[PDB]
Design a protein around this ligand. Structure first.
Ligand SMILES: NC(=O)c1ccc[n+]([C@@H]2C[C@H](COP(=O)(O)OP(=O)(O)OC[C@H]3O[C@@H](n4cnc5c(N)ncnc54)[C@H](O)[C@@H]3O)[C@@H](O)[C@H]2O)c1
Ligand SMILES: *C(=S)CCCCCCCCCCCC
Ligand SMILES: [Zn+2]
Lengths: 5, 297
């Protein structure tokens, strides 16, 4: 997955 | 399996230290964030007044987190490189907390350190590739962004570009050169997932330091350990609890059985734990020698 806040 | 056995004799730092020196504790995973590097002169995001979220006014962002998003970077790289110049330290000196992880390595206890930090301080303290997962990448190397080129540049090269206020361009193709950081919206490295899959099958203790556990998928690592693996948080405030509306840390409920919060400075908590373990002199001597050698550069 992607880096998310 | 998924039983909630209690392996700590008490939910205190003292209990954790006793557990660590029992035959059952062989494999420790550290999960660290920006809180371990604030005492090295690099602010975090969320500390009031000193954190970056309270110090981005003059960049005129739509919101403070934009300067760390890949969409914004690709449209306009200049703000990021300007901030990089403002934050870049003149000296890279790891903290007491970093050297406590070096001791875990040297004592044969460190299975892995997963870091959200990009500052290279784990490497400087002596953690190697066998030991370290840089989940959000690093400033240590940089690469050309053009798919057909991808030339690598060292930190000495990137530093010079940042301090000269010249947007860094590749010497081979003149495309942008980007530090090997994972911006918000980018994918994490392959080894994050391969390490996660393997390491959390067999972890005896999870040591979480200097993080608010708000960035994903890093924060979800706490839920990957076996349900009987004790979890120690060393942090200025509690973090990682399940939100009352939305695996999470349980320090205080009636059903708490394995999670311990030691509240304070990461350096102070690590020193306290070192002392219980009989490692205080080793830690003091290590830090003083390594700092002295860094100051001599
Ligand atoms: N040094 C760096 O590489 C660096 C610097 C700034 C931001 N970041 C990013 C910040 C982002 C979120 O990470 P996270 O660490 O949760 O940041 P964060 O700012 O959200 O949370 C930091 C946590 O550490 C706490 N804290 C700060 N200093 C100390 C201290 N000395 N002792 C004990 N606790 C302290 C703070 O209260 C907070 O709970 C990551 O993806 C990082 O890449 C990294
Ligand atoms: C994901 S939240 C990573 C975004 C990058 C944060 C950059 C931190 C400040 C740069 C400090 C320079 C250290 C060498
Ligand atoms: Zn190139």
């Amino acid at each position: 997955p992607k880096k998310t806040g | 399996g998924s039983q909630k056995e209690r392996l700590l004799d008490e939910l205190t730092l003292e209990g954790v230290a006793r557990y660590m020196q029992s035959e059952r504790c062989r494999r420790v995973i550290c999960l660290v964030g920006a809180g371990i590097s604030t005492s090295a002169g690099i602010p975090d995001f969320r500390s009031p007044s000193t954190g970056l979220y309270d110090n981005l006014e003059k960049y005129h962002l739509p919101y403070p987190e934009a300067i760390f998003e890949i969409s914004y970077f690709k449209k306009h790289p200049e703000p990021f490189f300007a901030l990089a110049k403002e934050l870049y330290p003149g000296q890279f000196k790891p903290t007491i907390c970093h050297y406590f992880m070096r001791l875990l390595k040297d004592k044969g206890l460190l299975l892995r350190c997963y870091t959200q930090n990009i500052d290279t301080l784990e490497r400087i303290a002596g953690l190697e590739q066998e030991d370290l997962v840089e989940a959000h990448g690093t400033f240590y190397t940089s690469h050309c962004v053009s798919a057909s080129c991808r030339h690598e540049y060292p930190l000495s090269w990137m530093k010079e570009k940042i301090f000269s206020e010249v947007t860094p361009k590749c010497e081979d193709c003149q495309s942008l050169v980007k530090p090997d950081i994972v911006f918000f919206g980018e994918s994490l490295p392959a080894r994050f997932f391969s390490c996660m899959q393997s390491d959390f099958l067999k972890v005896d203790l999870l040591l979480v330091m200097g993080t608010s556990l708000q960035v994903q998928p890093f924060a979800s690592l706490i839920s990957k350990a076996p349900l009987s693996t004790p979890r120690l948080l060393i942090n200025k405030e509690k973090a990682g609890q399940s939100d009352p509306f939305l695996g999470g840390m349980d320090f205080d409920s009636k059903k708490a059985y394995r999670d311990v919060a030691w509240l304070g400075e990461c350096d102070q908590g690590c020193l306290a734990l070192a002392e219980l373990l009989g490692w205080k002199k080793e830690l003091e001597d290590l830090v003083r020698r390594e700092h002295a050698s860094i100051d001599a550069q």
